[PDB]
């Protein structure tokens, strides 16, 4: 939980700008997109960095590329790879890291709209972000459907199988027999409608509160590499203030900066401190944190 | 909606 920051410059100036603009506008709230940065140091190991145990273990298994993983051919040639990511990765196997807890924070503070996430671990829900406030983009492990007709599955089905040894005997639907897999969005495959409806109807939020507060976009932790997820920052509205913690500048605030822009290098748990001191909340944190 | 999860 402890974290440093990224070089010897420091971010509380460029943060407090951030919990100034919160304090000028009381009642307004915030909406996040957050990437995988947001849960490293969590202890999630990425598929793609050899020197994790995943990497190799699906480097055994003729997994031909990383993301040949989360791709509907391979996995429906070859299912072993993605049961044996799913094995490390199921829910429940982390704790939310103390920027997942500034989402529940904001939550309690009733200063946030929405959080689009790209991540399949579900920290933030696991954090206790309300179901309404979360949009998993990429979908996740607590719905399963059989991928041929679509029949629904409970999710403990497929979790029952990962505590075999060894793995085999995948799930197959009861009525037309194809593979049954959980309702992550894989590559080549369009993500949930729920995605596209609340960013429409946050959209026009958005477009709206610039004529009455101000709301604010935060963008943490993202490449913003992947599509159509990566589209939003583009879209948000000229006149609404984008804010992005990243230790590097990527997409449209690289592609196309604004003047208004903010941006901040920085750990997502540092930034998350941060932020804490500058709006004077360290009280209520600390509570969330120890509880 | 925007299109199949991509690059
Ligand atoms: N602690 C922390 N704080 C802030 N930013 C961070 C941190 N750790 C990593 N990062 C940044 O977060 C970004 C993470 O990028 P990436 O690993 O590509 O993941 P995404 O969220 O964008 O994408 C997911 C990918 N996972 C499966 C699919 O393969 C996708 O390509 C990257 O630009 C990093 O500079
Ligand atoms: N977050 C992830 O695990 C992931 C895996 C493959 C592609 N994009 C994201
Ligand atoms: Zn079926």
């Keep these: 939980m402890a974290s440093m920051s990224v070089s010897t410059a420091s971010t509380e100036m460029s943060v407090r700008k951030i919990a100034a603009h919160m304090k000028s506008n009381p009642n307004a709230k915030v909406i996040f997109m957050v990437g995988a940065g947001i849960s490293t140091s969590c202890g999630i190991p990425d598929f793609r960095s050899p020197g994790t145990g995943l990497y190799h273990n699906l480097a055994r298994l003729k997994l031909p590329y990383p993301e040949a993983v989360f791709d509907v051919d391979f996995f429906q040639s070859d299912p072993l790879p993605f049961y044996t990511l799913a094995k490390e990765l199921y829910p429940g196997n982390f704790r939310p890291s103390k920027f997942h807890y500034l989402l529940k924070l904001f939550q309690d503070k009733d200063v946030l709209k929405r959080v689009y996430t790209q991540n399949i671990d579900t920290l933030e829900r696991q954090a206790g972000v309300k179901d309404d406030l979360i949009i998993e983009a990429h979908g996740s492990f607590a719905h399963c459907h059989c991928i041929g007709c679509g029949k629904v599955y409970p999710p403990q089905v497929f979790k029952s199988k990962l505590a075999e040894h060894p793995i085999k005997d995948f799930v197959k639907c009861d009525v037309c027999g194809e593979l049954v897999k959980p309702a992550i969005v894989f590559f080549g495959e369009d993500l949930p409608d729920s995605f596209s409806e609340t960013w429409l109807n946050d959209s026009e939020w958005l477009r709206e509160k610039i004529t009455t507060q101000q709301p604010l976009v935060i963008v943490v932790g993202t490449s913003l590499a992947v599509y159509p997820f990566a589209s939003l920052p583009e879209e948000i509205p000229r006149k609404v203030k984008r804010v992005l913690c990243n230790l590097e500048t990527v997409g449209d605030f690289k592609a196309n900066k604004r003047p208004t822009d903010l941006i901040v290098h920085q750990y997502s748990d540092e930034f998350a401190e941060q932020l804490v001191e500058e709006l004077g909340w360290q009280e209520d944190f600390e509570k969330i944190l120890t509880a | ?7």
């Excluded at chain 2, 909606?1 to 690059?7: C, F, L, M």
């Design chain 2, 1 to 7: 909606k925007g299109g199949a999860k991509r690059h």
